[PDB]
Design a protein around this ligand. Structure first.
Ligand SMILES: Nc1ncnc2c1ncn2[C@@H]1O[C@H](COP(=O)(O)OP(=O)(O)OP(=O)(O)O)[C@@H](O)[C@H]1O
Ligand SMILES: Nc1ncnc2c1ncn2[C@@H]1O[C@H](COP(=O)(O)OP(=O)(O)OP(=O)(O)O)[C@@H](O)[C@H]1O
Ligand SMILES: [Mg+2]
Ligand SMILES: [Mg+2]
Lengths: 587, 587
C-alpha cells in the first residue's frame, strides 16, 4: 500500500530539469557513503589501539609516537571525518528537500484553487490548509528521514554484516540474519497493531482543529449567544479523544522500541559470546572482540534513533496519503477537449434550454427551465426567497453543470467552451461579499490586479464609495479586517461593486448588489451602474429583492418554484396582474 | 529571556491537584535514574569481559561458565535493562505530557474566546488556530525533550565525569571540564548566530500560511475575478522566502552539529591518549581504556541525538513565546469590580448619554450622541450607509467602550454591570450571518443549546423557515456548508432570526434582518417578529434600510453623521419634512 506512495514520492529525489540539484543529490550520496565508511573504520582503529597497547605492554616505550600515537590520531580524525561528512551531506541535501517542499506546496495549492465549488462549500476552512501545510511538513520530514536516517542505517547494516562475515566466521552472518528476521517480524506485527491508534489520533486531532477553527470564525456568533462555555466544552471533548489516542500511540511505541531493542541486545550478547569463545580458543584477540562490540554498537545508534522518532515518520506517512488523496480528487467541471474560446458575435445573448438542476439528485430546483436573456439589455430576475435565482448566477458561471438541458451564450453551449474565456467574460457581484484581510485599495484592485491607481479611483467613483474612503484617516490604506468586517456592510458591498466595475466584463451579474444600502446610496449607485450598462451595451442581469431598483429594467423575469412563471417589462407585468403585481402591491 | 518561559512552563511538571500524575512523574524519574545507571554499568561489564578474557588467555577454559559467561549475561541484561527502563519511563511520562497538552490547549482557547472583538476582527483566521495547535505541539515536544533527552543526557555527563574522575586521575576531570566549557561557548555563539534564520523561517511560514488561508476563504472571489494565478504566485513568493530561510537554518545547524562534534571527538581522542599513556605506564589496563572509550561514546549517543533534533526543540521554544504572548494579551473590555448583574425594573429602557466613539482615535463616528430608546417599544434606527448605526448594536453589547459618555439600560451604566448578565439580556441578529459548518437544526438550536426539538421547530415557524426545511430532502439535518453557504442567503438570514427567537432575550437588536428576503417573506417574517415583540413587551431596536418594514415603529431614530438628526414616529417625521421624509419620498 504505502510502497505506492513512496514510489510516487521518489520523483522528488530525481528531478529531470535543473541537473544542479541532481549534482547536490550525488554529492550528498557520496558524502553519505564516505561518512558510513569512516564510521565503520573507527572500530578498526580502536582495535588497532587495543592490540598495539596489549601486545606491547612488556617492552618499555612512549605513547607519543613509539606505540600508538599515529593510530590514536587516526581514530580521532576518522571519527571527526564521519560526523563532519554526515552533517555536510545533511546541509547539502537540505536545499533539495526544501525546493521539493516549495514545488509540492505550490502544485497542491494550485490544484486546490481549480477544484469544484461544491468541494469548497462542503469542506472545513481549517482542514484544507492544515492538510496542505502538514503535508508539506510530512514531505520534508519523510525525505530527510529516508536520506538522512533510513538509507544510511541500511547501509550500516550492509557493511557491518559484510565485515563481520568477512573477518570472522559465517556464525556471525547467521546470527545477524536471524536478528534481522526477528526484528522485521516484530516490527511488522507491532506496526500492524499500532496503526489503529495512530489513525485515531490523527482523526481526533483533525476534529479538534475543525472545532477550534469553526468556533473562531464565528466569534461574533459565540459572543452574541453566550456559547463560549459550549465551544470550550466541545473543544475539550475533542482534545480528550486526542489525548487518549496519543497516550495509546506513545504507550505502543514504547513497546515497539523496547522489544526491538530486546532483539538487538540479545543479538549483541550472542555475538559477544561467539567472540569470547573465539578468544578463548585462540582464534580471536581482545581487539577483535572490541571490534565486534563497537561495530554492533555503532549500528545500534541509528537504530534507536529511528526507534525514537518512528512516531513522526509514520505520522508523515499517513499525512502522505491524506495530502496525495487531496491531490487525486477529480474535477467534475471539466472543459470539453478541443474547446474554442467564448465569442460574442452579437451582445451577450443568454438562453437557458430545458435546464434541470438540483444540488441533491432527489430535489430538482430548476425544473424544465427555459428563459432567454436578451443581448445588451438590463434584465431583472425576481422571485421568492430560496426560489433558485442565485443558482442561475453560479450555474451560468459553470460552477455547477445542469443534469439536463443546455445553456447558450450567443448560441454557444457553455459546456463546449473553455472555462477561462467564459469566466473572464462574466463578472458577478456575489450575494455575500467577503473581502481579503488587506487594505481597501487592494480589495478594489482585486477586480483587475494589474490596473493603475487612476482606474481604481475611477471604479471607486463609479461604485459611489470614493468620497467616504477619502474621508477616512487611512484613506485607501484603511484595513478592512477579516472577511471585510472592519468596514460597514454597505461600504463592503460597494467595494464589491467596485471590483466588478474595475473588471469590466461583457456580462454583469448583480446578486442583490444594493441589499445593504440606504435609499439614497442605492439610488445613486444604481444610477451609476445603469449608465455604465447603457453606455457600454453590457448584458446586465440583476437579481434583486428590492423591486424599486429594477422597475426600469428592459425585461423582468419572475422566477417561482424554479420555473419562469411570467416575463415582460414592468408595465406589462402590471397589466398581467400576476406574481410580479402581487410582489409590487405588497410594496 | 527564555529561562522565564521555561520557569513558567515548569508548572506542568508539578501539578498540585491530581497527585497521581505526580506519582507518574516520580516513577518516570526513578526509571530515568535507573536506566542511566544501567547504561553506565554496561561499559564496566565490557571492561570485566575484556580483562577476564585477557589475563586468562594462558590457562585453558571454556566460555560457558569458567571464564566469562556470567559477565557476558550481566552485560547483555544490563543493556536490556537500560533501554527497557528508558522506554518504560517514556511511556509513563507520555500520559502526563498529553494531559498537560489538553489542559494548555483548552485554557488558551478559552482565553481566546474571551478576548476583545477588535482583536478578532484585526487578526487572520489561519494565524490564531495555527498558533494554538502549533503551540500545543511545542509544549509536547519541549516537555518530552526536556524529560526524555535533555535531563537524562545531563545526568549522563554527571555520572561519566564522576566515574572518570573517581576511577582515574583528575586529568580526565580537567579534560572533560574544558570540553564542557568549549562546547557551551561554541553552542551559545552559534545559537546567537542561528536565531535570525530560525525566526525568519517562522515569519515566512506564517506569511505563507496566511496567504493560503485567505485565498481559500475567498475561493469564490478568486474564481469570480480569475485571480487563481495571482494567488498561486503570492503563495509561491511566500514559500520562496520560507525555503530560503529554512535552507539557511539547516545549513547553520549542520555547522553547530559539526563543530560541537569536533569538540567532543577531540575530547575523546585526548582522553584516549591519556588512557594510552596510563596503559603504557602500567597504571591502567586494556579494559580500563575500553571503559573510558565506551563511557564517552555512550555519552556521545544522546549528544548527537540532541544535535540532530535541535531544530525542532528551538522551534518549539519560539512557539513558546508566541503562544504565551497570545495568552498574555489583555482585554480592554473588563468588568468593574464588585459588579452586580443587570436588572430590568421597568422595560428595557436604553439611553445613550454624550457618547463619543471612534474605532480610530482620530475619527469620531458617534459624536456627542444622545438618544433614548423607550422601554418595551419597537424602535427603528435609520440613516445613510456607514453612518454608524450598526456601531450602536456592538457598542451597546459592550464589544467596544465609548471614549466619552455613558450608556444606561434602566439607569444602570453598562460599564458597571457584569458582561455575562448584559450579554444574556441582549439578543442580536447580525448584519452578516455566518453559520457553523453543521446541520440546520444545530444552527437553529445554537440560540439555546439546551432547548428541545419542539422549541427549535417553534422558532422555525416564528422565523418563517420551517416549511422550507420540511420540503428539503434532509430536513433539519440539511448541511449548510462552510459559513452557511450551502443554503440561500434569505434562508440563512431566517435561520439567524430563528436563533434570536430561540434565545428569547429581553432586548432584541435586528441589524437589517430582512435584507436578503423577498417582499412576501419579509412581510410575513416582520408580522411574526412584531407579534412576538408586542406579546412579550420586548424592547426591539430595528436597524433597517428597508423603510417599509419599520413604518409602524413606535419611535424612528434618524442617524446622520453620527448624531441623531431627528426622532419621532412615521407621521411626525412626515410633517417634519426632514431627512426621513427625503428617505421615504425617494421610495
Ligand atoms: N449546494 C447548494 N448551493 C446553493 N443552494 C443550495 C445547495 N444545496 C441546496 N440548496 C438550496 O437550493 C436553493 C437554491 O436557491 P438559491 O440559493 O438560488 O436562492 P437565492 O436566489 O440565493 O435566494 P436569496 O437570494 O434570497 O438568498 C436554496 O434554497 C438552498 O437552500
Ligand atoms: N473595526 C471596525 N468595524 C466596523 N466599522 C468600522 C471599524 N473601523 C472603522 N469603522 C467605520 O465605522 C463606521 C461604523 O458604521 P457602521 O459599520 O455601523 O455602518 P453600518 O450601520 O453598517 O452602515 P451599513 O449598514 O449601510 O453598512 C463605518 O463607516 C466604518 O467604515
Ligand atoms: Mg440570490
Ligand atoms: Mg448596518
Amino acid at each position: 500500500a504505502d510502497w505506492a506512495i513512496i514510489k510516487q514520492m521518489s520523483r522528488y529525489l530525481w528531478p529531470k530539469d535543473s541537473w544542479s540539484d541532481k549534482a547536490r543529490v550525488l554529492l550528498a550520496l557520496s558524502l553519505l557513503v564516505g561518512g558510513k565508511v569512516l564510521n565503520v573504520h573507527v572500530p578498526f582503529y580502536f582495535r588497532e589501539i587495543i592490540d598495539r597497547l596489549n601486545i606491547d605492554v612488556a617492552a618499555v616505550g612512549g605513547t607519543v609516537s613509539a606505540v600508538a600515537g599515529a593510530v590514536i590520531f587516526a581514530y580521532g580524525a576518522s571519527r571527526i571525518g564521519a560526523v563532519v561528512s554526515q552533517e555536510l551531506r545533511n546541509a547539502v541535501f537540505s536545499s533539495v528537500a526544501q525546493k521539493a517542499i516549495r514545488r509540492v506546496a505550490t502544485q497542491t495549492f494550485g490544484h486546490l484553487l481549480n477544484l469544484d465549488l461544491s468541494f469548497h462549500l462542503s469542506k472545513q476552512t481549517g482542514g484544507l490548509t492544515r492538510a496542505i501545510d502538514r503535508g508539506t511538513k510530512g514531505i520534508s520530514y519523510l525525505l530527510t528521514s529516508m536520506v538522512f536516517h533510513i538509507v544510511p542505517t541500511a547501509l550500516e547494516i550492509g557493511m557491518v554484516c559484510g565485515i563481520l562475515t568477512y573477518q570472522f566466521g559465517w556464525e556471525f552472518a547467521a546470527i545477524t540474519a536471524a536478528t534481522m528476521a526477528a526484528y522485521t517480524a516484530f516490527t511488522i506485527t507491532t506496526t500492524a497493531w499500532r496503526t489503529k491508534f495512530r489513525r485515531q489520533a490523527n482523526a481526533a486531532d483533525n476534529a479538534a482543529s475543525t472545532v477550534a477553527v469553526d468556533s473562531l470564525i464565528n466569534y461574533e456568533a459565540v459572543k452574541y449567544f453566550n456559547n463560549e462555555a459550549y465551544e470550550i466544552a466541545r473543544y475539550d471533548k475533542a482534545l480528550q479523544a486526542y489525548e487518549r489516542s496519543s497516550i495509546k500511540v506513545a504507550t505502543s511505541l514504547a513497546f515497539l522500541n523496547s522489544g526491538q531493542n530486546i532483539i538487538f541486545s540479545s543479538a549483541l550478547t550472542l555475538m559477544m559470546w561467539l567472540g569470547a569463545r573465539g578468544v578463548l580458543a585462540g582464534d580471536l584477540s581482545v581487539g577483535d572482540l572490541v571490534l565486534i562490540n563497537q561495530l554492533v554498537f555503532q549500528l545500534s545508534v541509528p537504530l534507536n534513533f529511528l526507534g525514537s522518532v518512528y512516531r513522526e515518520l509514520r505520522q508523515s506517512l499517513l499525512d502522505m496519503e491524506t495530502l496525495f488523496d487531496l491531490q487525486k480528487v477529480n474535477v467534475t467541471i471539466r472543459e470539453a477537449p478541443n474547446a474554442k474560446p467564448l465569442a460574442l458575435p452579437k451582445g451577450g445573448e443568454i438562453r437557458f434550454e430545458n435546464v434541470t438542476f438540483g444540488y441533491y439528485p432527489d430535489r430538482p430546483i430548476l425544473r424544465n427551465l427555459s428563459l432567454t436573456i436578451p443581448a445588451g439589455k438590463k434584465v431583472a430576475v425576481v422571485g421568492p426567497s430560496g426560489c433558485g435565482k442565485s443558482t442561475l448566477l453560479r450555474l451560468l458561471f459553470r460552477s455547477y453543470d445542469p443534469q439536463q438541458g443546455k445553456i447558450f451564450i450567443d448560441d454557444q453551449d457553455i459546456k463546449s467552451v473553455t472555462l477561462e474565456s467564459l469566466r473572464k467574460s462574466i463578472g458577478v457581484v456575489p450575494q455575500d461579499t467577503p473581502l481579503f484581510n488587506d487594505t481597501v485599495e487592494l480589495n478594489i484592485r482585486y477586480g483587475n490586479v494589474n490596473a493603475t491607481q487612476e482606474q481604481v479611483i475611477a471604479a471607486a467613483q463609479k461604485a459611489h464609495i470614493h468620497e467616504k474612503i477619502i474621508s477616512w484617516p487611512h484613506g485607501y490604506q484603511t484595513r478592512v479586517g477579516e472577511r471585510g468586517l472592519m468596514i460597514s456592510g454597505g461600504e463592503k458591498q460597494r467595494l464589491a461593486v467596485s471590483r466588478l466595475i474595475l473588471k469590466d466584463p461583457p456580462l454583469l451579474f448583480f446578486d442583490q448588489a444594493t441589499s445593504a444600502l440606504d435609499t439614497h446610496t442605492e439610488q445613486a449607485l444604481m444610477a451609476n451602474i445603469n449608465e455604465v450598462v447603457k453606455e457600454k451595451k453590457r448584458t446586465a442581469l440583476f437579481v434583486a429583492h428590492r423591486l424599486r431598483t429594477i422597475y426600469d429594467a428592459d425585461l423582468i423575469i419572475v422566477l417561482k418554484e424554479g420555473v419562469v412563471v411570467e416575463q415582460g417589462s414592468h408595465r406589462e407585468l402590471m397589466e398581467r396582474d400576476g406574481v410580479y403585481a402581487e410582489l409590487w402591491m405588497a410594496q
